[PDB]
Design a protein around this ligand. Structure first.
Ligand SMILES: N[C@H](Cc1cc(C(=O)O)nn1-c1ccccc1)C(=O)O
Lengths: 269, 279
């Protein structure tokens, strides 16, 4: 019985209240296809979980025949490595290596950092990083003056303890932007996004699979379009888990099957 | 041991092959690469010919040789292309690996389920997939476009095709049976062959490896041939290094590749070899 952790991140994981009798509200798509929902415990009430990853967890659970319990990550973070001297990981990463999760199913970005300590499946989604701005605000993209030059008249940030924070911190040439950002990063993408709608935040640097989806729904927002960096989401597992190879075999299969395609038409596009 | 037999396969811009400088030395961003060249078509005898090899993946192979610290004897594959299981005996680059004639294959080799059951693939180092090239102005979502799955639902019916006997043809044959049947009469010789049929209005669309269609579109004179957005690419995947099942090198190769995408060294190679003049 695998313990799967995950994290609220539309459109990959919607997290929605339970009905009275502890069941999830039955739902279909406007294309007439059933909306699978699994119970997920978290910050500690059980709730209802669905979305792109969730269907993907169900295909994996069926393909490789296991059972599972899902929960939301304790600290609500993706995970970076921090000092205590020893070092430790926060968010989904720390839970994966502590044994609190047997597998991460989420938009977990694959990077050399994480991959040193955990195994990733072959990517299940190909995406990148982009910038989300409130429509009306018009910057040219990653090299816009008001961005390469930092100043508290135009505030831009990413998400605390994420692959984007790692990315902006590992690279000596991103030092100025990163010095601006760490004074402004948000604990979660919903917060950060809700700020851009409240004018409190001006540019969000986040995953295009998520930011592009927020522009197509919340039409007060929009992104740049330019992808200044490209990255992939993988399933995370502990070093040498029995599952790693069959998991990624199942990801390749689902790409060629068009299964991932149908997830994109259901959740992302 | 850290001296390694590596197989590759010519396919500009990922691997580009040149004769040796006449001198017999491979100068510049070229690396030596031998090729066993047959004497005639009715004997197994041949000579090992010396050539020089450059390109996007050759630059990859260089960085890995420096980062992961190995040396290598690169050769090109004589029997087959990327690797096809023919009566359960692989040819291509995959076959040189499975039958332990190379310990890794470097090239424009796509990562698929079938190959992964017999070789190990490193993390992908360039995104590819199945994509659609059209002349600018044709409106097409992607492979799963209705104008492709039910072609006679539109008048005139679209004229599209691919180059048969590859992965694009096979993938389509399995996923869209009636699309496969219809586009058969529109099979192409090869990529340069199908571009011209696009540009002279003979063909309406070309369905093929997405990295290769992007690279073509980048360097198309007049910038009139275009591919669909990256978000409409089907069976997204990527090029990777094939190693042997259980290879002890896969770990250092994966870390090395993810480092090169992380610190910018990969985007630089992309801009060096892959980015063209259109858009
Ligand atoms: N790299 C080639 C694969 C390439 C050639 C074929 C073909 O000739 O049809 N199409 N693709 C492709 C199919 C799906 C995803 C990505 C690429 C390989 O290794 O075969």
């Amino acid at each position: 019985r695998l313990k799967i952790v995950t994290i609220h991140q539309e459109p990959f994981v919607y997290v929605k209240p339970t009905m009275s009798d502890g069941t999830c509200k039955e739902e279909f798509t406007v294309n007439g296809d059933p909306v699978k929902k699994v119970i997920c415990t978290g910050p500690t009430v059980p709730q209802c979980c669905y979305g792109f990853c969730i269907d993907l967890l169900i295909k994996l659970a069926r393909t490789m025949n296991f059972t599972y319990e899902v929960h939301l990550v304790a600290d609500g973070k993706f995970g970076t490595q921090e000092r205590v001297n020893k070092k430790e990981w926060n968010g989904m990463m720390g839970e994966l290596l502590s044994g609190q999760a047997d597998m991460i199913v989420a938009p977990l970005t694959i990077n050399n950092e994480r991959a040193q300590y955990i195994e990733f499946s072959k990517p299940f989604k190909y995406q990148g990083l982009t910038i989300l701005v409130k429509k009306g605000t018009r910057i040219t993209g990653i090299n816009d003056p008001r961005l390469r030059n930092p100043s508290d008249k135009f505030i831009y940030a990413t998400v605390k303890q994420s692959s984007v924070d790692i990315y902006f911190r590992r690279q000596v040439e991103l030092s100025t932007m990163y010095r601006h950002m760490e004074k402004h990063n948000y604990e979660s993408a919903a917060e950060a996004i809700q700020a851009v709608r409240d004018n409190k935040l001006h540019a969000f640097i986040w995953d295009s699979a998520v930011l592009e989806f927020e522009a197509s729904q919340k039409c007060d927002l929009v992104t740049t379009g330019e992808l200044f960096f490209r990255s992939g989401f993988g399933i995370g597992m502990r070093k040498d888990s029995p599952w790693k190879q069959n998991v990624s075999l199942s990801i390749l299969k689902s790409h060629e099957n068009g299964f991932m395609e149908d997830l994109d038409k259901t959740w992302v596009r | 041991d850290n001296h390694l037999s590596i197989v590759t396969l010519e396919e500009a811009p990922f691997v580009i092959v040149e004769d040796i400088d006449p001198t017999e030395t491979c100068v510049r961003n070229t690396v030596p690469c031998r090729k066993f060249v047959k004497i005639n078509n009715s004997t197994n005898e041949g000579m090992n010919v010396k050539k020089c090899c450059k390109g996007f993946c050759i630059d990859i192979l260089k960085k890995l040789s420096r980062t992961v610290k190995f040396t290598y004897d690169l050769y090109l594959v004589t029997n087959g292309k990327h690797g096809k299981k023919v009566n359960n005996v692989w040819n291509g680059m995959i076959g040189e690996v499975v039958y332990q004639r190379a310990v890794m294959a470097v090239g424009s080799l796509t990562i698929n389920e079938e190959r992964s059951e017999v070789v190990d693939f490193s993390v992908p180092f360039v995104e590819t997939g199945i994509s659609v090239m059209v002349s600018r102005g044709t409106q097409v979502t992607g492979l799963s476009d209705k104008k492709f799955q039910r072609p006679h639902d539109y008048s005139p019916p679209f004229r599209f095709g691919t180059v048969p006997n590859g992965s694009t043809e096979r993938n389509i044959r399995n996923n869209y049976p009636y699309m496969h049947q219809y586009m058969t009469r529109f099979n192409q010789r090869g990529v340069e062959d199908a571009l011209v049929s696009l540009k002279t209005g003979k063909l309406d669309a070309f369905i093929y490896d997405a990295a290769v269609l992007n690279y073509k579109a980048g360097r198309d004179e007049g910038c009139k041939l275009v591919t669909i957005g990256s978000g409409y690419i089907f069976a997204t995947t990527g090029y990777g290094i094939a190693l042997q099942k259980g290879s002890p090198w896969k770990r250092q190769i994966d870390l090395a590749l993810l480092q090169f995408v992380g610190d910018g060294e990969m985007e630089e190679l992309e801009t060096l070899w892959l980015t063209g003049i259109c858009h």
